[PDB]
Amino acid sequence: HEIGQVPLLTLEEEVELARKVEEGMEAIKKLSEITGLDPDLIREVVRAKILGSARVRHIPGLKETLDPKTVEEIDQKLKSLPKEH
């Protein structure tokens, strides 16, 4: 019943989401270069804010314990970028 609550994608929507996922990964790669951070750490920080405050935990491999302090600190370094970055 719960899966049946998400409608199946149209060919356009399927391509759209897929497109956005690929572009986002490339964005995280670029955001790593600009910032001097770790692409995975950035990815988990990006992902943390999307899913919300609900899910926050240490991720095996990330260099920092991923607690609300670090996701705020790192998010503030990402939001300190110029408009084009």
Partner: protein, 157 residues
Amino acid sequence: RVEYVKKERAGLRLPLAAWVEKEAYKPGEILAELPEPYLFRAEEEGVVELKELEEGAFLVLRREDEPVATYFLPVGMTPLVVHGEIVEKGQPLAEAKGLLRMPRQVRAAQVEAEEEGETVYLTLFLEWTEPKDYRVQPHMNVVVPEGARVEAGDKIV
């Protein structure tokens, strides 16, 4: 659909006892009223490049390939020529019958007027938008919002 902006200089000749004097013409505005049908005639010899709008028309004479004249036919003026037709100086291009007005899609910014005999020749500085449609396929995404301003070279899809 991209409505492309065109700003061009086109001429017209009308009787004098029939044209209403204004410094500019808004779209839809009446340009002249003819007592009897008047034949607008070629003032150059050339091959005709005819460009028809939604309402109204453009006519462009060229010899060799160099454009020698650009004429504007408002609404109420029926072309008597077809695209790519050879014309000689003085043969009627279009008939103007009754009330002739600006088309809905095209304006007249600055209007210069010369007087010769019983006719006036308008040099019209016209601004209008010519529509062109583009088809977007499922694997394509439109990167541009409704109403965006684009110059030559900008990516739309």
